[PDB]
Amino acid sequence: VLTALELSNELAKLANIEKEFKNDYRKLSMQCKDFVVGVLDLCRDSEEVEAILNGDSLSRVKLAIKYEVKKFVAHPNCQQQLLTIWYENLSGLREQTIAIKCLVVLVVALGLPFLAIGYWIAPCSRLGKILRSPFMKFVA
């Protein structure tokens, strides 16, 4: 999978450099991307999905983002893992409606100075884990 990602990037760079056989190199890079996406698609356990998404820190997801391997990142096997970290330390809030999320954003907007000053003790408190989740960082 790492070999296919690197080869896809190399073939895309060659497609840019040549411009004569750009279609050939783009087709080859698409072949590499398709291979990576299919190998990810074969996964049927969390262990396999993790092994694909980071090698031996989502390393392969970051590499695919860098190399514009869009179908690998957008695959449900990767998306579920990304949502796992995204909605970390907060499980019920994932299932809430969009209106509840907007209300949470409004509450955070109202009370941002209070939580900011409480961050001096938050890591020793439970609320520090809540505010340190990626979704809460985005909301903040």
Q: Which is nearer to a copy of itself, 41 or 118 (CB)?
A: 41
Residues contacting 16, CB < 8 A, separation 6+: 22
Per the CB < 8 A criterion, the answer to whether 26 and 15 are in contact is yes
Query: What x-and-dash track marks residues 34-73 binding a copy of itself by CB under 8 A?
Result: ------------------------x--xx--x----xx-x
- Choose the stretch contacting a copy of itself; rule: CB under 8 A; options: 25-33, 42-50, 79-87, 118-126: 79-87
Q: Which is nearer to a copy of itself, 102 or 116 (CB)?
A: 102
Strands, E assignment, 27-130:
none
Distance CA 121, CA 115 (A): 10
Distance CA 54, CA 65 (A): 13
- Choose the stretch contacting a copy of itself; rule: CB under 8 A; options: 3-11, 26-34, 82-90, 108-116: 82-90
* Size of the residue set binding a copy of itself (CB under 8 A): 26
Per the CB < 8 A criterion, the answer to whether 77 and 46 are in contact is no
Torsions phi, psi of 58, nearest 5?
Answer: -75, 75
Q: Which residues bind a copy of itself (CB under 8 A)?
A: 17, 19-21, 23-24, 58, 61-62, 65, 70-71, 73-74, 76, 78-80, 82-83, 85-86, 95, 98, 134, 138
